[model samples]
Target: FVSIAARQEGAVGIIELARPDVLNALSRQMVAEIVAAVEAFDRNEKVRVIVLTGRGRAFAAGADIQEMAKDDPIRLEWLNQFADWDRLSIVKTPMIAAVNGLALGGGFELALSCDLIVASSAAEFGFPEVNLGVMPGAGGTQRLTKLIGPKRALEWLWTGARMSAKEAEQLGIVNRVVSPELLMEETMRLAGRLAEQPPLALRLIKEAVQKAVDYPLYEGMQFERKNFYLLFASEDQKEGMAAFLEKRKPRFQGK
Candidate 1:
């Protein structure tokens, strides 16, 4: 099961899956709760950042095969939802996955869906759904390839092998690695730096970069131009410029 709680940042939502015994399997309830928590946080202006982490040992082991038993009528659909959960990663708001321990199978897919990822040195990750006679129903097939490129993604998924923290970071799957005990501390430290920036600017930067990855130059350039123009009209920009000229710290109100 997954549970969500509010962080002290007020604007950051902390979500944790409680079923470490089963690697925090993606039961229907886990899917429902995770989706619901994201939707709920998405609506709250106070909740600007959402951090997904696992409790106890494993971050998440992916879908609960035991609970799933075998592929049925909804197998594909459930897999899709797992992917949809990752779409929360692509949301405009900042999302960070704190890989506390093991992030396996669909659990790894769930992490793949996040906007950014952080892992503990002790963390282990992989896509082993193939070992269970299924495949990554979530963004594993799609996003993973998009992330690591076709060749490497195929090697990992096809082999259904587990990768260590250093290997994942080297492969570009895990962005940063930390000591397991300090995972949350380091993640929040980085997030604190992010929170200090003008929220709108951060959102704009993320939008610009992610779009540019796949969008044609003309379209992306046009999008960049629009966002560029939009920034000039903000309270943050004026305050930012004035503060700089006056040699003072900028206090961005996200206008």
Candidate 2:
């Protein structure tokens, strides 16, 4: 089997991290496969939402330490190791992460990139790169800090401390926490709900939320209003309103 696997559940695509032997470590090739899987699902008209999860034990522990050790420290920048992962942040399709186990370093960063995270009660998250004499290079420092604030982010990253799913939820890092057996079920339920929405609107909604994070309040509001107005031009908007008035369900054709 490959290091990654992609399967469709109705309109949602689930991308599984399959390398459990190394705790599904984010090897260079595995990262590339992830990028490809995401891009492939985004191109499929039938796929409106995506879920990312691990096959067993962990979503991913971290980058492949053995591979990193083999690289020439002198020309490290030439590797551009995290380029593929960077794409996850901006991908148009809505992504839900089902974190079933330990998510450290790159693994934690991966969950942060998703629009929503549903972690199992058994899950644990941390940024252990500091212990390795390095730090999270794939937007972890910036993203985690933005979500939980600088102080808490520093405590987690600086000490390489692990966090339970309950604590992560309290800090607003995880959207929901469930039993390990129910993690995927709950994640797919949420993804399925998202998949029922209009595709164009979902994509625009993602853009608007990202804008809110990246822009000032006034600018983000303006951007959101523009997208809100833009939706009126779509046929789905008209059908949605019409169906509500007619007391019927709207059958969206992704217009």
- Which is the leading candidate under lDDT? 2
Clashes of 2: 0
lDDT, candidate 1, 117-180, per-residue tens: 9999999888888887778876678878887888988888888998899998988888999998
Model 1 spans with C-alpha error above 4 angstroms:
1-10, 73-90
| lDDT tens per residue, model 2, 1-255 | 279988998999999999998999998889889989998898898999989999889988988888787667666788777778777666898999999999999999999989999999999999999998889989999999999999898999999999999999999999999999999888988998999888879889899989988899999999999999999999999999999999999988788
RMSD of each: 2.3, 1.3
Residue pairs whose backbone atoms clash in candidate 2: none
The lDDT for every candidate, in the order shown, is 0.80, 0.90
Q: Could you tell me every candidate's TM-score relative to the true structure?
A: 0.90, 0.96
